[PDB]
Design a protein around this ligand. Structure first.
Ligand code: CLA
Ligand code: CLA
Ligand code: CLA
Ligand code: CLA
Ligand SMILES: CCCCCCCCCCCCCCCC(=O)OC[C@H](COP(=O)(O)OC[C@@H](O)CO)OC(=O)CCCCCCCCCCCCCCC
Ligand SMILES: CCCCCCCCCCCCCCCC(=O)OC[C@H](COP(=O)(O)OC[C@@H](O)CO)OC(=O)CCCCCCCCCCCCCCC
Ligand SMILES: CCCCCCCCCCCCO[C@@H]1O[C@H](CO)[C@@H](O[C@H]2O[C@H](CO)[C@@H](O)[C@H](O)[C@H]2O)[C@H](O)[C@H]1O
Ligand SMILES: CCCCCCCS[C@@H]1O[C@H](CO)[C@@H](O)[C@H](O)[C@H]1O
Lengths: 56, 122
């Protein structure tokens, strides 16, 4: 069968499933962004933008 | 003219002090031979400010605005006491009794809740 490093090649001639894979990728990236921002809000201390800004 | 409990109940007006007309710019004579009292003192807070506490200790901390979270339960009222006329013609109010405190919780930016006993006791 297909070697492990070629599994996604099944999409090359299947535009609908390629779009589905792409949709999944974008869902994952956007969920990362939402999750990342929530984790940063759970940890960020806003009380000192002078000596404790976001980049510290 | 005058409101009953049923007119007031649940409106918020019970937590408000009485107001006077813009017309009320008069003068109330004090006869220094007469004794006086305050029969009703009412205090309706409209803003609570809390002094932020810096790490800086350089530059003075400001008083910042806060959000009231305990609803219309903040005013002091039905307070009474003697209004003394002093020998130099100054008046001194000596609080005796009344609804002279309210626990109040206000919330700062970012969530810190600051309870206080808002009061004029004694
Ligand atoms: C954007 C990511 C993504 C997308 C959209 C796809 C989509 C596809 N894959 Mg690929 N794949 C991926 C990443 C992805 N894969 C990764 C990271 C691996 C290595 C694990 C694989 C290995 C793989 C194999 C071996 C096969 C496919 C196959 C397929 C097709 C059918 C679905 C399937 O069987 O998935 C497989 C199911 C997964 C890959 C689950 C991913 C494992 C993650 C890490 C678990 C996530 C759970 C949770 C949210 C997070 C836990 C993290 C941790 C803190 C514990 C489809 C085209 C099949 C096929 O069509 O081949 C011809 C197939 O046999 N994929
Ligand atoms: C848009 C970017 C992109 C896309 C859509 C693809 C898509 C494809 N690649 Mg290419 N490729 C890319 C960039 C990309 N590649 C990059 C940057 C490199 C160098 C790293 C490669 C090097 C490469 C090789 C050497 C091969 C492909 C192959 C393939 C095909 C099969 C992939 C597969 O089944 O893996 C299945 C993968 C797994 C089951 C697991 C991989 C797990 C990795 C190593 C670790 C986990 C990654 C983590 C989940 C992802 C976060 C990503 C983010 C940080 C970027 C498919 C057409 C294969 C081919 O041509 O088939 C004929 C092939 O041999 N790619
Ligand atoms: C006017 C026609 C039109 C428009 C507006 C688009 C727009 C888009 N196409 Mg292209 N496409 C078109 C014609 C069009 N396409 C034609 C005729 C073909 C040949 C059939 C393709 C083949 C094609 C492929 C093969 C792919 C795209 C993808 C994309 C998207 C990539 C950006 C993205 O996902 O952002 C993120 C998305 C958003 C911020 C959401 C946008 C809001 C959506 C679109 C509303 C959904 C409702 C709508 C009625 C459903 C169908 C929309 C459809 C017309 C695109 C984007 C929505 C890629 C994609 O889908 O990846 C996920 C992808 O893989 N297109
Ligand atoms: C420009 C931005 C960008 C681009 C071009 C890509 C491109 C890619 N992404 Mg996506 N990704 C992005 C941003 C991006 N990503 C962001 C911001 C997130 C949120 C964190 C993700 C989350 C994400 C997930 C969860 C997955 C992808 C996967 C993929 C691959 C799907 C095609 C494929 O089959 O590859 C075949 C695989 C390769 C060609 C190898 C890529 C090797 C990368 C470049 C370096 C990984 C190196 C190292 C071994 C990582 C080990 C991690 C370990 C320490 C845990 C492709 C290389 C999917 C994938 O890799 O499936 C196998 C996958 O599961 N991405
Ligand atoms: C965030 C989400 C994260 C989830 C992702 C997790 C999935 C990651 C999967 C990675 C594993 C892939 C390894 C497959 C390994 C594997 O299948 O190898 C054998 C494989 C042979 O392929 P063939 O084409 O012969 O196909 C046979 C098929 O049966 C394979 O599917 O070759 C490759 O895969 C090419 C690249 C690997 C070559 C690596 C060899 C390493 C040598 C040893 C090094 C250590 C010793 C060093 C000493 C100094
Ligand atoms: C599917 C693609 C994945 C590629 C990832 C490569 C990253 C390395 C950076 C670039 C150097 C490339 C030199 C390749 C040399 C080259 O030209 O390769 C091309 C080769 C495919 O070539 P062929 O199609 O000719 O197949 C040759 C096979 O038949 C074996 O003989 O690609 C692979 O073998 C893909 C697998 C490499 C996998 C490497 C190990 C990944 C381990 C990940 C550990 C993850 C831990 C996760 C923890 C949660
Ligand atoms: C979209 C669906 C998913 C939504 C759910 C995910 C929510 C994540 C939101 C993060 C923002 C809230 O972040 C959270 O805030 C409070 C208030 O400072 C912190 O709480 C901390 O300080 C407060 C106030 O002194 C203490 O009473 C508390 O015990 C202590 O843990 C949390 O440690 C922090 O992690
Ligand atoms: C998508 C909905 C996420 C849920 C949001 C939680 C409320 S918002 C949250 O409030 C905390 C307390 O006031 C703050 O300390 C923190 O900075 C703020 O991000």
């Amino acid at each position: 069968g297909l070697p492990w490093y070629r599994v996604h090649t099944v999409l090359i001639n299947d535009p609908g499933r390629l779009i589905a894979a792409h949709l999944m990728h974008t869902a994952l990236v956007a969920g990362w962004a939402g999750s990342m921002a929530l984790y940063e809000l759970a940890t960020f201390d806003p009380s000192d933008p002078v000596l404790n800004p976001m980049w510290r | 003219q005058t409101l009953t409990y049923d007119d007031i109940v649940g409106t918020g007006l019970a937590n408000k002090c009485p107001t006077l007309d813009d017309t009320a710019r008069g003068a109330y004579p004090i006869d220094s031979s007469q004794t006086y009292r305050i029969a009703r003192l009412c205090l309706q807070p409209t803003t609570f400010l809390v002094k932020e506490e810096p790490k800086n200790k350089r530059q003075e901390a400001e008083f910042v605005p806060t959000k009231l979270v305990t609803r219309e339960t903040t005013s002091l009222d039905q307070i009474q006491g003697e209004l003394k006329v002093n020998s130099d013609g100054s008046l001194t109010f000596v609080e005796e009794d009344g609804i002279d405190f309210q626990p109040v919780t206000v919330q700062m930016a970012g969530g810190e809740r600051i309870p206080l006993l808002f009061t004029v006791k004694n």
